[model samples]
Target: VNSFSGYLKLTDNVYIKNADIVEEAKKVKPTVVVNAANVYLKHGGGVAGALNKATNNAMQVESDDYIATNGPLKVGGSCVLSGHNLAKHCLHVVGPNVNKGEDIQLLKSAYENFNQHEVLLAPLLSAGIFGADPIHSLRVCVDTVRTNVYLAVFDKNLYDKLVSSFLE
Candidate 1:
């Protein structure tokens, strides 16, 4: 319900949230919340690590098994984990290694490869450290806005609304 530049609607409920990624998942109460994970499912730093911690550290171990059996996750690859923190379902994705939008492409690929939920949340793929403006980094996300990916993006007021929804 907030506004950001380059905003476009791919679907009736599909849009990008520039306000923030925090609690963006709770805002939708979805069965799947995507993680900007690495090839090894390592969540020791960045957004993935923190989100894993918040998920009560349940994803790493589960991810380990998934990785062991599946092999290093390819670009645009994702796996679902039983959501433990707030989201009832958590998805792990391999994102950029050093502030690049390549990860965004992969995120989109993974979504395209396997996603069937109405309620979904995705962070603006790779804008930080990837050294691109948020919109530029998310160029692929924006590009694919009208095609098929369902990510929950939020803005300033909506972010605050998520908190209020949880606090009471």
Candidate 2:
């Protein structure tokens, strides 16, 4: 299996790499770990599940509280919740289901939503079952993220593909 551990400079401040999101988040101590969330912010699978597990399910509890108070997150929207054992906090952003051309813009909005933080640990939002094209998702991340970001990619094939895509 191929693995990547190098960084690409996307902008003056933005940087990206394929690495362990939670472990690197602990190392860099970013202001928030971005969760590629569902509209409900449920930590059921993919990046969300891993972060919730890393935080001893405290992330899920807090997400539950957030939804109960603020209502479900709208697609292309975000909210910051407790990170628990992971980092300072978690930023949950719901990426849009890719059906229309404008869905890419919604995904970009999701990435831009985290711009207030100078450092971030984010996943490739909507590239999983949410169905955003993987390369397009990478492009959005490279374009919108204005700060340091560590992209957590667990699948080796996807990681390799993203690494090559970013290089191209």
Candidate 3:
């Protein structure tokens, strides 16, 4: 897959209500997931939390060790690990705490860093705890990929709930 700035196009979807993203991703073989994590790499809440549970929670350890040695993942930068309970490989992109469109560039870089053939990314990075508007954040994900990005909205209500009650 490929990603760039200004413009983007891929097989995009905003399917709503409920999406078992992990199960869906597993069906798309050769799919690498993008974990929306901070520099600290803790997959405690949000999508990361769900992924952690579905993937045997090993993702947290990998991310933790990476930051322990590399000193926190950089904005727009990434770290990839062999998937344990998930894909053979998974990509971790450090999303901004409070992002403007600038993270789009960084996200572009993150996608490039993955360097895989197929990707299934349903990242809601800047929303929720990051406090970025979901519409804008979704647009960034949509516009950053080069080809065939399997983007989904999953659960909008759960997302809003996290922002209201869980994310703090």
lDDT of each: 0.55, 0.76, 0.58
Q: Which tens-of-lDDT digit does each residue in 1-168 have in candidate 1?
A: 221234344445455544334365445454566677667777777667767776677777787877789887766666677766546777675545445445444545644533455455666554343333344434455444443344444455643443343344
Q: Candidate 1 versus the native: TM-score?
A: 0.64
Model 2 spans with C-alpha error above 4 angstroms: 1-6, 99-102
Under the 3 Å rule for N, CA and C atoms, how many clashes does model 1 have?
7
Give the candidates in order of TM-score, highest first: 2, 3, 1
Off by over 4 Å in 3: 1-18, 99-117, 156-168
Could you give candidate 2's per-residue lDDT for residues 102-148 as a string of tens digits? Answer: 36678878888878787777888887767788878888887887766
Give the candidate order by descending lDDT: 2, 3, 1
For candidate 3, lDDT tens digit of each residue in 67-166? 7788877776777776666666667776666643444445455545434545445565555565565655555655565544544446767545533432
TM-score per prediction, in order, is 0.64, 0.85, 0.68
**Worst window of 10 by summed lDDT in candidate 2:** 1-10
Clashes by residue pair, model 2: none
Model 3: lDDT equals: 0.58
Q: Which one is best on TM-score?
A: 2
